[PDB]
Each structure stands twice: as structure tokens, then as C-alpha cells.
Design a binder for this molecule. Sequence first.
Ligand code: NAP
Ligand code: NAP
Ligand code: JBR
Ligand code: JBR
Lengths: 207, 206
Amino acid sequence: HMAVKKIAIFGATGQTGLTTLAQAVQAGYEVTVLVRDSSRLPSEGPRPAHVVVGDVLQAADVDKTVAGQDAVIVLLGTRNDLSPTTVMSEGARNIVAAMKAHGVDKVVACTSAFLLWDPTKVPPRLQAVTDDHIRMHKVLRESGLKYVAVMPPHIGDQPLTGAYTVTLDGRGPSRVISKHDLGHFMLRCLTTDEYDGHSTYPSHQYQ
Amino acid sequence: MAVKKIAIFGATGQTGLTTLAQAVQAGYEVTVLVRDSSRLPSEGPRPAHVVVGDVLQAADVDKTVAGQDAVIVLLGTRNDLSPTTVMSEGARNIVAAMKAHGVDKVVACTSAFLLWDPTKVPPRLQAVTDDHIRMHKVLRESGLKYVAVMPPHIGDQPLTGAYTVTLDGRGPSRVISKHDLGHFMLRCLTTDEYDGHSTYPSHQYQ
Ligand SMILES: NC(=O)c1ccc[n+]([C@@H]2O[C@H](COP(=O)([O-])OP(=O)(O)OC[C@H]3O[C@@H](n4cnc5c(N)ncnc54)[C@H](OP(=O)(O)O)[C@@H]3O)[C@@H](O)[C@H]2O)c1
Ligand SMILES: NC(=O)c1ccc[n+]([C@@H]2O[C@H](COP(=O)([O-])OP(=O)(O)OC[C@H]3O[C@@H](n4cnc5c(N)ncnc54)[C@H](OP(=O)(O)O)[C@@H]3O)[C@@H](O)[C@H]2O)c1
Ligand SMILES: O=C(O)c1cc2ccccc2c(Cc2c(O)c(C(=O)O)cc3ccccc23)c1O
Ligand SMILES: O=C(O)c1cc2ccccc2c(Cc2c(O)c(C(=O)O)cc3ccccc23)c1O
């Protein structure tokens, strides 16, 4: 019943990844995850269909994760770490190469609403990570793949609602999206082509 | 000082390709050193002279620099993650060839990381930045008229020709379009006001 049913999730162990994984498994997706050796999925949580242990910085590991999929969700990040990094942009380069080799077209990837900002107004403490989001978005935009650029504001702990606003190619009217709603939106992007080639800013007022 | 013939190194890269196109459309007689001719586009603006070879091969560089009025350097390694000397060894070959042929003017791209604290550099870019620093030193010590171009993030925005150029420091914006960056490399051929300076081109797109 699902045009998209086998998906790879990068960053499934992270804040948004964990609830995206849980929702995807409940929705009937056959999920493959790439996890780093020292940080596997928690014993409590939902179980994906396939687990690749490795690093998004290894093309071989990314290839093993992307092979055979219908689509890719990207929720990579550096947890609390604000240091200069290229893990997201280099990871995206590997994902793009693997998708082209394996005939996968659809990629839904999370960067940041700061990419819709006047670049000079981003807080300096956040500029190093934002710089790699900028690099990652460029890699994905230039790939020619069917790319939904998800650019959220603050990721919060509020509920799953499915009632959030999706603003196309600009900043939205609220400054938060719950991690659960952000994961819900990443999965919604698999069911439609309407956001392909756009930037999307999901946001909501939790009340 | 009027420049008609230029060599471009790195013409097949993202900045090189648009610099080449703009140079050809503006009337420059352009010589490129390319390792593979098939990487030059089949259509549109074509360079006047194509030397097939390697910036690591001194004979190939000498052949490219001979008879030019100025040199544009847009070399890069793209994927090197660990110590690498391709750019600095290329620049040594370029300097020796410019000296042997009486070519005075070189406009060379490194990166704005040379204007930031070293702790700003992502670990996997430290090797390429180290070699940018080595290449910059090679060019500054050469005695040639050298404009050091140190761009921030290189984007894909359309050509504007309206960017700002900050001298010997960082400017307000943190992006430059590859087209604007190539525009600025060519602007450096028409003036000596940037010689011996570091230049930081940047703009706000929109
Ligand atoms: N927090 C906010 O308010 C906010 C707002 C806007 C945008 N963002 C951006 O949204 C994105 C998702 O944020 P989040 O909080 O959900 O993510 P997160 O909690 O930081 O999780 C990052 C994910 O990436 C994985 N990862 C990191 N490096 C990896 C590597 N080399 N190889 C394989 N996997 C790797 C992590 O695995 P490990 O378990 O092994 O660490 C983890 O699963 C981030 O890019 C973030 O910057 C956040
Ligand atoms: N991307 C950014 O945002 C950014 C920011 C700051 C600074 N920079 C720096 O700006 C400079 C230009 O960047 P770019 O992205 O436009 O360059 P690029 O797309 O990576 O192209 C590099 C050029 O150098 C050539 N090259 C590499 N090794 C060579 C060799 N041995 N012999 C002859 N040619 C060789 C390449 O030829 P082939 O086609 O044969 O490979 C290519 O034409 C780089 O040094 C880069 O580090 C980039
Ligand atoms: O708690 C924080 O550290 C926090 C700090 C901020 C600093 C400046 C502007 C917005 C901030 C937001 C809300 C927010 C926004 O409002 C917007 C926007 O309106 O485009 C985009 C954002 C993108 C990423 C993260 C937050 C975003 C935060 O939560
Ligand atoms: O813009 C930046 O701040 C930036 C700064 C750099 C400074 C020194 C050397 C390379 C840099 C690249 C190269 C680069 C990369 O490093 C990556 C990556 O890390 O995946 C992807 C690229 C995609 C297209 C073109 C260049 C790419 C940048 O981009």
C-alpha cells in the first residue's frame, strides 16, 4: 500500500531520530538504521527491520545502509556540541553518492531554519554548526535528487499533534516544533512530491 | 600593466569554471592547465589554449605560464582529509615559472580560515587549511605582485557584481557566490590596489 516502504534513517538514535523511528515502525515502514558502534538503539524502544553498525563518514557504511531503499531520512547532528564540524556535510556527500549508485531518489534531510535567516544575524555560538548545515544543504541541493530541505526552528519536547504549520520557502509564524511533530513531518514528506525542491519550516503553537 | 593573456589553474573546479566563462566572455585570451580535457564543457565559452598536464609537473606549469600577463590560481584538492601538499607544491612550481618568464601578477584563492582563529577550522579541514597557509606563504615570500583572495563559504547564487571587498581582515557577510568570486578574481587583473593585501569578498544575497 506504500510507494515508499523501505527507508534508511540516519541519526535514528538522536532526539528527533528516536521518535521518527518509533513513528515509522508504527506506520508500517521497513526501517534500516545506521548507528555508531558505541551508541546503539535503546533496549526499550522500537526495533528497526535492519541495523548497520558504522559511521556516516565511511562511504562503505552509508552504501550498506542506502542499498535497496525507497527513500532516505537524514536527522544527523552533533548533540550538544557546538564545535566546528563537517560530519553533516560529509555524511550528506556520502549519502548522495550512495543514493545515485543505488537508484534512490527521495531524500528528506533536516538542517535548520537559520538557513532562512540573514546569515549575519545567526548567533555566533551557533555559527559553526550552522556553517555545516549550509554546506550540507548545498551538497543536497546540487545533487539533483528529489530533496526536501527541512529547516526547523527550536526542537521541543511538546506532543505529537500532526497539526503543525508547514511554511514553504520562508520562515514560519511560530518558533518551535516538537521533536515528535518534526519526525511526523519527515515521514509525511515520503508520501507526497509537493515539497520536493523546496525548503520547509514546520512550526506550531502547543496549546 | 594592461592584462590580455592569463593562465587559470583550477579552471575545471566550481569557481574555475565560472571564472573561465566570465574571462572568455570579457575578451581575455585564457590558457588553462587541465588534467583531463573532457572536464571542460562541450558548449559555450571555450579557452583559447588548453595545456594537458598536472600542476605538480614543473614542465606543464612552465608551458602554461609562458607568455602570460597574469596568473589566476583556483586550485583545490576537494577530498583531502589528511596532510596534503598539492596546492603548496603547485604554487612553488607556479612561482618558479612566473619568475622564469617575467610574469609579475598572481591572484590566488585560499580561504577565510586564514583570517579566523585556528580553532574555527573543522578538524577534517585542518589539513587543507594547513596547505593553504603553506601556499599563501610561498606566494607572499615570492616577491611577485600577489593578491591573496580569502573567501568565506562559496555559494551558488547568481552573479551580482555588487559584493564588498574587505582589506586585510574579515567583512560583514559570510558568503560569496562562486560567480561573484570569479568576477572578483578578474577584477584583480585591472588594478594594483589589492597587491600585497589579503582580500575578503562577501555579499548578502537577496
Ligand atoms: N535542537 C534544536 O533546537 C535544533 C533546531 C534546529 C535544527 N537542529 C538541527 O536538527 C538536526 C537534528 O537534531 P536532533 O536534536 O534531533 O539530533 P541529535 O540529538 O543531535 O542526534 C544526532 C544524530 O546524528 C548521529 N550521528 C552523529 N554523528 C554521526 C556519525 N558520524 N555517523 C552516524 N551517525 C551520526 C547521532 O548518533 P550517536 O547516537 O552515535 O551520537 C544521532 O543519532 C541537527 O542537525 C540539529 O543541529 C536542531
Ligand atoms: N567550497 C568553499 O566554500 C570554499 C571556501 C573557502 C575556500 N575554498 C577554497 O577555494 C579554492 C577553490 O575552491 P573550489 O571549490 O572552486 O575548487 P574545486 O571545485 O575543488 O576545484 C579544484 C581545482 O583544482 C584542480 N586541481 C586539483 N589538483 C590538481 C592538480 N594536481 N593539477 C592540476 N589541477 C588540479 C582541479 O582539477 P580537476 O578537475 O582535474 O580535479 C580543479 O580544477 C580551494 O582551494 C578551496 O579550498 C573553498
Ligand atoms: O533556545 C534557543 O537556543 C533559541 C535561540 C534563538 C536565538 C535566536 C533566534 C531564535 C532562537 C530560537 C528559536 C528559533 C527561531 O525563532 C527561528 C526562526 O524564527 O526562524 C529559527 C530557529 C532555528 C534554530 C533554532 C532556534 C530557532 C531558540 O529556540
Ligand atoms: O563552505 C565552506 O565553509 C567550505 C570551506 C572550505 C575551506 C577549505 C577547504 C574546503 C572548504 C569547503 C569545501 C567543501 C566541503 O568541505 C564540503 C563538505 O564538507 O562536505 C562540501 C563541499 C561541496 C561543494 C564545494 C565545496 C565543499 C567548504 O565548503
